[PDB]
């Protein structure tokens, strides 16, 4: 059984989860906004 797919899990790093696709990716698609 692999472990990918599931997001990360370490809030002890600072506060929010580490994840791997947030403001970085979530905004790289945002560009899909119609000007």
């Amino acid at each position: 059984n692999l472990d990918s797919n599931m997001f990360s899990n370490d809030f002890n790093f600072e506060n929010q989860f580490d994840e791997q696709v947030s403001e970085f990716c979530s905004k790289m698609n945002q560009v899909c906004g119609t000007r």
């Binding site: 791997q20 696709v21 970085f24 990716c25 790289m28 560009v31 899909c32």
Partner: protein, 86 residues
């Protein structure tokens, strides 16, 4: 086996000023998304002095919104990751 001083060139002169007919490309470049490059970053034990902020304003406006999420040609991340390597 030749006059050597044969001053001349190919009679091609084929200019063909075709416009940027970008359709069904076929050059070297895989299709990857955002964090997708995060994997590229790891695949290179090099690393030294790169800027993650430059990739943001470089891959964020080269982004191509598609249902398969955002997709960009590895030729932009390879030129954006190789132009910031001091």
């Amino acid at each position: 086996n030749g006059s050597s001083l044969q001053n001349a060139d190919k009679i091609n002169n084929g200019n063909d000023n075709d416009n940027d007919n970008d359709v069904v490309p076929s050059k070297e470049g895989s299709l990857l998304r955002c964090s997708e490059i995060w994997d590229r970053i790891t695949t290179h034990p090099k690393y030294s002095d790169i800027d993650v902020d430059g990739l943001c304003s470089e891959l964020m406006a080269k982004a191509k919104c598609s249902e398969r999420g955002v997709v960009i040609n590895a030729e932009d991340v390879q030129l954006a990751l190789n132009k910031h390597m001091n």
